[PDB]
Structure formats: structure tokens, C-alpha cells
Design a protein around this ligand. Structure first.
Ligand SMILES: *[C@@H]1O[C@H](CO)[C@@H](O[C@@H]2O[C@H](CO)[C@@H](O[C@@H]3O[C@H](CO[C@H]4O[C@H](CO)[C@@H](O)[C@H](O)[C@@H]4O)[C@@H](O)[C@H](O[C@H]4O[C@H](CO)[C@@H](O)[C@H](O)[C@@H]4O)[C@@H]3O)[C@H](O)[C@H]2NC(C)=O)[C@H](O)[C@H]1NC(C)=O
Lengths: 438, 53
């Protein structure tokens, strides 16, 4: 047998779907999502660490000179001086007055902890949403996971399900992503081969372990002063230690739809957007034949309380004329109220209790128990608590149906002057047919 | 490592408004955002006894 439905995407919200077919009792399902990830389709543009400049020991020469080297290295820069007088610790050091040069050399590379802590820069062009729906019917509760696109298909017990494509294609990321340790940043990073000193991306390597480092940290190599032995230089500071402080927040603290952002297989888990379509394949050995079901006649419901609270704040009472005990399956044929627990146990006496939940002042929902229906009407009252710690179990709908007390006064003003308007027409119809001819 | 926790802030519920009362002992951080269609992030290093809505 085949059946389709759509469920809203909010987590911790048991949805009920109703199945009707000729020759069997009606049956209700219970789909309830328990988690939802959203992994982008990554590719590392580059990776960023905190650099290390290695200035080796400066090589003097006491009589001759020396020349430049032109080695191959990321930000290599060496240049030789004229005659300097070292004067190390006791007396002089070359024992001349001039013609004693001092070659200086400096370069940069990646860190030593670059494989441990690092910012990782990715690109999010597509995304594949997973889910963790649990499924409840009869005496069967399972919990399966499935990629939410309209072709993957999973089986539960003796039935099979598949989940359609997500309605929208919205991402909390953008096409740019920065992953340091626990905080993806939605910032348009500067691209590869165009790093800027001081700002994020001063050193850039294509993957975690490779050659071909890229760096322009503006390394300048000045001239040594009077008679001490030191190699001085100047450099713009490490960008990556500015970005550890000057980072404002994460993206976990300014995500749009209230979604936590984990980091290690970079994720966007538990969003709240759109709705998910389903497809059912319940076989025939799950229903009950109509002979085995308990026959129900003469329904009549009668409300008691009905507050507007976000939980199941409403209790109804129903009467009936049965013939044998059994187990029915209730359902609501409106999006105004949602009856809880779906699986009542009918007995000999004609009296059961339910629990529903509305959001408007006057409902008009209609209840089917076992192939028999009736309609319920209530007069409801607003609650008192302003801030509640849990979510919303109803559907957001505020409209009195047709016969609420707030709309009954409308029909006693609409029929009043509207019935007097046609009476002013019916005078003119008589006048424009009697004394247009006499 | 080890990091201390802050005291639980006192709240007062109002109609579509929440007045929270704060008590630091050293500069701590505050952040809230609306988990609906549009976020409105707010962030500030609270230093003394203040009171926000
Ligand atoms: C349908 O599918 C499930 C398969 O697991 C089965 O029903 C589940 O049964 C388990 C227990 O066997 C339920 O899990 C636990 O229920 C406990 C009972 O709840 C009481 O206590 C809480 C807490 O005060 C009250 O709110 C509640 O009203 C009850 O009085 C909970 O205490 C457990 O809490 C755990 O998680 C919370 C976080 O949510 C932690 O804070 C706790 O420390 C603890 O770790 C937990 O919820 C489970 O809820 C049931 N799932 C359902 C009903 O969907 C059934 O067997 C199966 N149906 C059939 C017919 O077989």
C-alpha cells in the first residue's frame, strides 16, 4: 500500500499521519524527528598556522669578504654589509679597524605545532542533509537514519520508507568557511596566493603536510648597530594571534535559525527550516480487517477546559455505543488541534478521555475514532505565564471558525444592515416598475 | 584546564520581555540571539552589577 505525507522540520514534534483504505480499520502513524545534520561539500583551499622565523647565528669574516647566496626558501632575504667592529666580550674580535664584513641571513617557514592547531578554509557549494527519524506504529518502534534526498531508501521492520528532497536549499554558511578548532567562521577569506600581512592568511599551505609554503609577512632586515654582535630585523606580527583575540564571536553565536555549529566533520546540526516529504510502503500484514475491529456507533463529544497553553492544555470527553472491547486509533481532521497519544483502548461503557491542544479562542476540529466521526466546539481561555521553557506543540493558527462568540456578533451586524440594504432596494424595484408605466 | 562558572542570573518575566539581573566578580561575556527567521546578535563584556532587558 502507498501513502505520502509532509512533516514540519522542528525537532521533538510528534506528527501523526492517517491511513484509510477500504476493507480495513483506519490506522495512524507517528513520525518524530530526533536530529538533523547538514554537512557542506568541503574542499580545503588552504590551511593556516602561526609562523616561526629562524635567524641563525650571524657569520662574520675578519679579513676577507663574503657574498650573497640566493637560496630557495619562502621569504628568504640575506644581504651583506661593509666593515663592522664586533667587540664581543673581552677586547675586540677581528683585531682590525676595517675590512671585516658580517653576512646576515633570515627566512620563515611553518610552525612546529602546525599539525596540531590550525585554521582550515573550505568552500560550501552543496550540502547533504541527514536525519534520525523514529517510526511508531502498532507494537513497533525503530529508529533509522537516511540522507534526506528523494532517492535514498531505508527499511523498518517489514516496511520501507524514503524521504523526499528538502523544500528549500538554504545554508547557514556561505560559500566561504574558516575552521580553527571549534568555531567555523562565515567570513570571506582572502584566496590562495594573495595573502596579506597582519590580516588572516599571512602564511598559507595547500594541505596539512606538503612543500610549497606561501608567505609575505614583510620581513625586513636592517643594519647592525655599534660594537655588539646581534642580527636585528623587523617584521609585521603574527596574524593568527590577532585572529585568536580579534575574533568577535563564532558562528555558533550568530547563526540564523538557531543551529549549533560543530566542527570536526564540519557540520551544521539541528536547524529549523522548511518541511520534509515522506513516502510509505506499509504492507498488508499490518492492518486489521474490519470484522475484527470493534464497531463504534453514535459519537458525541463535549469539551471541558481548553486553555491556550503551549502544551496539551485541553481535555474532551466522548460517548458512544460500542458492541465489543478493543483498540481504536483516533485522529484529528483539522490543523487547529492535535490530539495526543493516538491509540485509545475502547471498553464496554461509552466514555473515553482525550488530550488536545489548540492555539485559538474557538476550535472546530472533528474526531474519528473507528470509521465514525463527530465535531467538537469549545470556548477557550488564554493562559497566564509569559515566558515558558519549552517550545510549541500546536500549529500557529488564530482564527475562530464560523460560529464562535467573537464571530456571532459579526453575523448579527452583517445580516442586520445587509438585510436592510436589500429592503431599500426592494422599495426602488417597486417604484421603478409601477410609476415608470403609469 | 580549569575555568570557574558564573552565578546563575536572576530573571523576571514580563509581557514579551525578560529582565535579567547580573552579578560578576570579573569580566564575563554575554551573548543572546533570536532563534527565528532573523538573528539579532548582542555581545558585551559585563564588568559590574548591571541590569538588562
Ligand atoms: C517505543 O520506543 C521506545 C524505545 O526506546 C520505548 O519507550 C521508551 O522507553 C524509554 C525507557 O524504557 C524512555 O526513555 C526514558 O524514559 C524515562 C522515564 O521518564 C520518566 O521520567 C522523566 C524524567 O523525570 C519524566 O519527565 C517522565 O514523565 C517519566 O516520569 C526518562 O526518565 C529518561 O530520561 C533520560 O533522558 C533524559 C533526557 O531526555 C535525561 O535527562 C535522563 O537522565 C535520562 O537519561 C528517558 O526519557 C523513552 O522516553 C521511551 N520512548 C518513547 C515513549 O517514545 C517503548 O518500549 C516503545 N514502545 C513499545 C510499545 O514497545
Amino acid at each position: 500500500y502507498e501513502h505520502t505525507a509532509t512533516i514540519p522540520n522542528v525537532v521533538g514534534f510528534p506528527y501523526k499521519a492517517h491511513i484509510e483504505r477500504n476493507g480495513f480499520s483506519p490506522m495512524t502513524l507517528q513520525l518524530e524527528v530526533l536530529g538533523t545534520s547538514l554537512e557542506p561539500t568541503l574542499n580545503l583551499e588552504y590551511i593556516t598556522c602561526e609562523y616561526k622565523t629562524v635567524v641563525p647565528s650571524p657569520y662574520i669574516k675578519c679579513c676577507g669578504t663574503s657574498e650573497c647566496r640566493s637560496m630557495e626558501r619562502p621569504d628568504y632575504q640575506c644581504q651583506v654589509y661593509t666593515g663592522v667592529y664586533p667587540f664581543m666580550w673581552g677586547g675586540a674580535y677581528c683585531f682590525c679597524d676595517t675590512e671585516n664584513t658580517q653576512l646576515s641571513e633570515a627566512y620563515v617557514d611553518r610552525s612546529d605545532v602546525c599539525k596540531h592547531d590550525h585554521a582550515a578554509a573550505y568552500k560550501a557549494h552543496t550540502a547533504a542533509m541527514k536525519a534520525t527519524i523514529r517510526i511508531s506504529y502498532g507494537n513497533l518502534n525503530q529508529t533509522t537514519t537516511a540522507f534526506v534526498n528523494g532517492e535514498h531508501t531505508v527499511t523498518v521492520g517489514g516496511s520501507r520508507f524514503t524521504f523526499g528532497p528538502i523544500s528549500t536549499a538554504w545554508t547557514p554558511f556561505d560559500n566561504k568557511i574558516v575552521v580553527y578548532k571549534n568555531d567555523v567562521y562565515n567570513q570571506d577569506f582572502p584566496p590562495y596566493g594573495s595573502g596579506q600581512p597582519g590580516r588572516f592568511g599571512d602564511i598559507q599551505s595547500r594541505t596539512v603536510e606538503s612543500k610549497d609554503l606561501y608567505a609575505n609577512t614583510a620581513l625586513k632586515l636592517s643594519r647592525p648597530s655599534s660594537g655588539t654582535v646581534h642580527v636585528p630585523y623587523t617584521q609585521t606580527p603574527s596574524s593568527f594571534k590577532y585572529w585568536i583575540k580579534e575574533r568577535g564571536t563564532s558562528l555558533n553565536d550568530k547563526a540564523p535559525f538557531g543551529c549549533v555549529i560543530k566542527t570536526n566533520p564540519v557540520r551544521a546540526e539541528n536547524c529549523a527550516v522548511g518541511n520534509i516529504p515522506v513516502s510509505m510502503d506499509i504492507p498488508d500484514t499490518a492492518f486489521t480487517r474490519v470484522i475484527d475491529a470493534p464497531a463504534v456507533t453514535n459519537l458525541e463529544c463535549q469539551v471541558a477546559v481548553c486553555t491556550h497553553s503551549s502544551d496539551f492544555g485541553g481535555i474532551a470527553t466522548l460517548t458512544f455505543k460500542t458492541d465489543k472491547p478493543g483498540k481504536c486509533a483516533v485522529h484529528s481532521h483539522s490543523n487547529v488541534a492535535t490530539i495526543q497519544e493516538a491509540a485509545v483502548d475502547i471498553k464496554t461503557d461509552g466514555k473515553i478521555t482525550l488530550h488536545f491542544s489548540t492555539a485559538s479562542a474557538s476550535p472546530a476540529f472533528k474526531v474519528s475514532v473507528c470509521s465514525a466521526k463527530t465535531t467538537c466546539m469549545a470556548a477557550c481561555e488564554p493562559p497566564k505565564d509569559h515566558i515558558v521553557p519549552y517550545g510549541a506543540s500546536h500549529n500557529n493558527q488564530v482564527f475562530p471558525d464560523m460560529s464562535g462568540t467573537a464571530m456571532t456578533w459579526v453575523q448579527r451586524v452583517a445580516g442586520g444592515l445587509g438585510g436592510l440594504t436589500l429592503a431599500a432596494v426592494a422599495v426602488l424595484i417597486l417604484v421603478t416598475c409601477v410609476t415608470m408605466r403609469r | 584546564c580549569r575555568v570557574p562558572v558564573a552565578r546563575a542570573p536572576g530573571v523576571t518575566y514580563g509581557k514579551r520581555e525578560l529582565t535579567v539581573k547580573l552579578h560578576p566578580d570579573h569580566p564575563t561575556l554575554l551573548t543572546y540571539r533570536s532563534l527565528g527567521a532573523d538573528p539579532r546578535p548582542y555581545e558585551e563584556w559585563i564588568d559590574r552589577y548591571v541590569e538588562r532587558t
